[PDB]
Amino acid sequence: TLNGGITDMLVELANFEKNVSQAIHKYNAYRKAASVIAKYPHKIKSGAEAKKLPGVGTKIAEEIDEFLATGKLRKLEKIRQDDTSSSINFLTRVTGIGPSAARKLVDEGIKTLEDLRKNEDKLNHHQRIGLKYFEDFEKRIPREEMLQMQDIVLNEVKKLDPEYIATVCGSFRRGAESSGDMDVLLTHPNFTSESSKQPKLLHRVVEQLQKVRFITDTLSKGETKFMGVCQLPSENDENEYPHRRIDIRLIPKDQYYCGVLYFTGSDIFNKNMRAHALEKGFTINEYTIRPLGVTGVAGEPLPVDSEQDIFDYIQWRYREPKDRS
Numbered sequence: 530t531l532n533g534g535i536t537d538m539l540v541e542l543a544n545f546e547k548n549v550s551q552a553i554h555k556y557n558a559y560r561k562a563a564s565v566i567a568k569y570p571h572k573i574k575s576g577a578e579a580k581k582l583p584g585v586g587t588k589i590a591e592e593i594d595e596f597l598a599t600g601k602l603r604k605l606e607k608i609r610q611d612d613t614s615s616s617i618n619f620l621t622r623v624t625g626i627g628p629s630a631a632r633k634l635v636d637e638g639i640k641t642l643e644d645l646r647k648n649e650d651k652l653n654h655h656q657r658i659g660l661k662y663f664e665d666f667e668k669r670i671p672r673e674e675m676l677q678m679q680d681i682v683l684n685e686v687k688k689l690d691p692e693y694i695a696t697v698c699g700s701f702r703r704g705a706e707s708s709g710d711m712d713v714l715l716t717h718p719n720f721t722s723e724s725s726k727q728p729k730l731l732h733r734v735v736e737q738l739q740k741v742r743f744i745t746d747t748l749s750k751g752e753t754k755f756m757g758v759c760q761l762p763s764e765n766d767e768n769e770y771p772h773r774r775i776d777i778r779l780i781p782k783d784q785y786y787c788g789v790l791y792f793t794g795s796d797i798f799n800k801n802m803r804a805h806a807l808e809k810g811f812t813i814n815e816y817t818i819r820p821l822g823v824t825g826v827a828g829e830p831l832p833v834d835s836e837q838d839i840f841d842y843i844q845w846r847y848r849e850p851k852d853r854s
């Protein structure tokens with residue numbers, strides 16, 4: 530406005546004393562001083578004309594002369610470039626880790642750049658390889674490269690035993706020109722709802738992947754899920770294809786095409802899909818499709834041999850992946 534560059538100033542002063550300090554009475558005084566300047570119908574040109582108004586005071590007018598010369602203030606940006614605030618935004622920047630370890634990490638006086646080795650008395654990691662491939666995780670992944678990651682893995686799988694089936698999901702199957710990672714799903718006809726549990730089916734696929742040296746590291750094992758790091762092979766070009774990021778997941782044969790729909794679709798889409806079923810009278814899950822009716826009591830599960838057997842059941846014209854936004 531007229532003096533309405535010095536009212537933007539005086540507001541922020543009042544927030545920090547409300548919060549991270551909590552000096553009331555000095556929350557109050559800052560605040561009244563804002564209004565008096567807002568009402569005065571004349572452009573101020575010196576903190577020397579300010580003491581005359583019954584609102585502004587002693588050390589307050591003083592802070593205005595520094596404002597009206599430079600156009601910047603000591604008692605301000607110092608609170609702005611030092612706070613835990615606008616550093617929560619920084620501290621994680623250079624970490625690739627977890628919520629409450631920061632604080633104690635930071636609390637050691639350890640920070641972003643030239644503040645990083647200065648104090649390394651935590652000797653943790655992530656899990657022992659976060660802080661190392663920190664550099665390649667923050668770049669996107671071109672489509673063209675996704676296609677030949679895909680092609681290698683299906684090749685190994687089938688050569689072991691042609692009864693396996695496997696497919697890749699996420700943004701890649703929707704049709705992106707760039708991705709953030711890889712997510713794959715895996716089944717076999719000797720694992721079902723009513724059977725013994727079999728991790729050895731997933732161990733084998735992993736071990737042979739290491740053998741041809743496509744998989745390089747391990748972050749997590751289990752009976753159902755693996756979590757690691759991979760790389761494409763070179764003939765002798767530049768320094769590197771960057772190291773990348775892959776997940777793998779084992780599922781019952783009879784609940785397969787119910788999970789694949791689920792690891793694609795789209796959030797918004799998957800939400801609009803489960804309401805139309807309510808209308809026609811069905812209930813749909815990450816595991817099954819069941820007959821409902823009358824009240825809260827679903828029936829048996831109905832049989833499914835394909836993605837499309839699902840659409841039929843609820844009376845919808847089919848919709849290809851490219852269109853599931």
Ligand SMILES: [Cl-]
Nearest residue numbers: 626627654655
């Ligand atoms: Cl961690």
Ligand SMILES: [Cl-]
Nearest residue numbers: 698699711712
């Ligand atoms: Cl994917």
Ligand code: NA
Nearest residue numbers: 621625626627
């Ligand atoms: Na993080």
Ligand code: NA
Nearest residue numbers: 700705707708
């Ligand atoms: Na995308």
